[PDB]
């Protein structure tokens, strides 16, 4: 099929070199411009540059010029983006895309094919397991009948962590939030369970947190305050 | 080179038509293309040469341009239409000292489309003080859990006693809950000393212009 397949995501340290790839298939690789775009998580699309595979003619964005280099290997239908020295500001999801030339009544171009993206995280943070703290039951439904309790999964790197309750036995009323990235470069998230206030004195609540990168497994009992 | 301006957000009711603008100094003579992007996914081409739809794109989506403004119009909007929309164009110029024409791909900052598929629902706010365990670890984190709200957008303001506090604050983008409503979380990192020295800390959430706040104090 007609597509662009990019290399795998990586966590890099600032100062390190990097080269990511984009393998094209399904059409004549040499004849269509290839573009690169970066998207910082939660932000918009930022143009990096375009390169013509047949002759390597290239146009760069002033924001990326001299910081990254575009190249292609015609023999293997692959386009690359490379850095000599990474900076934390290089963090982001990098997409390669094909500029198609529509040969209609009037000619025009558009990026019709897009790779799946390559997530590059440039951080000086070391792989670390989180500290898990209980979030003791607190009235949720105006002291009517439900309460909210949970677990704070603090300071881990990199993502992700998985959170279960009662070894997977409890699934109803559970919500595990996306993580936040704090100024320390470490992530934190919370998982909350909404439960009947009348159960706080009978039912047991244990959150099971697993952070595979650090081989960290923690079980934390969440009990009512005092 | 010229900047492409888009409204950061557009709201629409299901079945009605939504319009997204894109303005730029040279757009009146530059072809505009539009792209759609669902959270976590890759962009998809929706329109090119101002008004042309690539194969597979439904007729209910149209593109136009008047003056320096390009417009993407989505009729018969549906919940699945939610996501980000980006306009794109080009700039071409030759350096004063030569070197041939230099090309630039320009992107608008994007517009997030919201399709109001259910009634407005005010958020429930639960504020958790630092756990005794975290305090015994010489740390303190206040956790503000926001839930059951719609649409999925809120702003959070923290206060130390009565003064605004922005340092050490982190908030997640609202995520859908099992019941189709939204939830969000906000964190305030403090030192045990700060936690102990103030009379209270508060988390005030604003949803659709209305506020809901919770306050906590050292045990």
């Amino acid at each position: 099929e007609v597509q662009l397949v990019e290399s795998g995501g990586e966590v890099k340290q600032p100062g390190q070199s990097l080269k990511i790839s984009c393998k094209s298939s399904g059409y004549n690789f040499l004849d269509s411009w290839i573009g690169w775009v970066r998207q910082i998580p939660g932000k918009g699309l930022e143009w990096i540059g375009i390169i013509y595979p047949d002759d390597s003619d290239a146009h760069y964005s002033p924001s990326f010029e001299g910081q990254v280099t575009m190249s292609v290997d015609k023999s293997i239908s692959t386009a690359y983006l490379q850095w000599t020295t990474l900076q934390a500001s290089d963090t982001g999801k990098y997409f390669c895309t094909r500029l198609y030339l529509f040969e209609g009544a009037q000619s025009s171009n558009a990026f019709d094919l897009w790779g799946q993206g390559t997530m590059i995280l440039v951080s000086s943070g070391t792989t670390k397991g989180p500290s898990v703290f209980p979030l003791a039951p607190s009235s949720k439904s105006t002291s009517g009948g439900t309460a909210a309790l949970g677990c704070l999964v603090k300071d881990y790197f990199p993502e992700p962590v998985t959170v279960s309750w009662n070894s997977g036995a409890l699934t109803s009323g559970v919500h595990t939030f996306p993580a936040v990235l704090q100024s320390s470069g470490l992530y934190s998230l919370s998982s909350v369970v909404t439960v009947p206030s009348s159960s706080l004195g009978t039912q047991t609540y244990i959150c099971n947190v697993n952070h595979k990168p650090s081989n960290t497994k923690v079980d934390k009992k969440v009990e009512p305050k005092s | 080179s010229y900047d492409l301006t888009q409204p950061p957000s557009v709201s629409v009711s299901p079945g009605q038509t939504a319009s997204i603008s894109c303005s730029g100094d040279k757009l009146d003579d530059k072809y505009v293309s539009w792209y759609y992007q669902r959270p976590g996914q890759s962009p998809v081409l929706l329109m090119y040469q101002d008004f042309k739809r690539p194969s597979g794109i439904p007729e209910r989506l149209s593109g136009s341009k008047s003056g320096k403004t390009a417009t993407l119009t989505i009729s018969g909007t549906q919940s699945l239409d939610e996501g980000d929309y980006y306009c794109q164009a080009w700039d071409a110029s030759t350096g004063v000292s030569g070197g041939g024409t230099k090309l630039t791909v320009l992107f608008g900052d994007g517009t997030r489309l919201t399709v109001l598929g259910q009634p407005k629902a005010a958020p429930s706010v639960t504020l958790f003080p630092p756990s005794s365990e975290e305090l015994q670890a010489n740390k303190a984190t206040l956790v503000c859990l926001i839930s059951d709200f719609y649409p999925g957008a809120v702003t959070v303001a923290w206060k130390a006693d009565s003064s605004p506090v922005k340092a050490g604050v982190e908030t997640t983008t609202p995520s859908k809950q099992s019941n189709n409503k939204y939830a969000a979380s906000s964190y305030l990192s403090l030192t045990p000393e700060q936690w102990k020295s103030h009379k209270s800390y508060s988390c005030q959430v604003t949803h659709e212009g209305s506020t809901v706040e919770k306050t906590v104090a050292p045990t």
């Binding site: 004849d31 269509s32 411009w33 013509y52 047949d54 003619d57 500029l99 030339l101 009037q106 000619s107 025009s108 171009n109 | 003579d29 530059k30 072809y31 040469q49 080009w90 700039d91 071409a92 024409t101 090309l103």
Partner: peptide, 14 residues
């Protein structure tokens, strides 16, 4: 040519 990029009406490079 196939390397052509049309910026707008009456304006195409390559």
């Amino acid at each position: 040519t196939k390397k052509g990029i049309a910026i707008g009406p009456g304006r195409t490079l390559y």
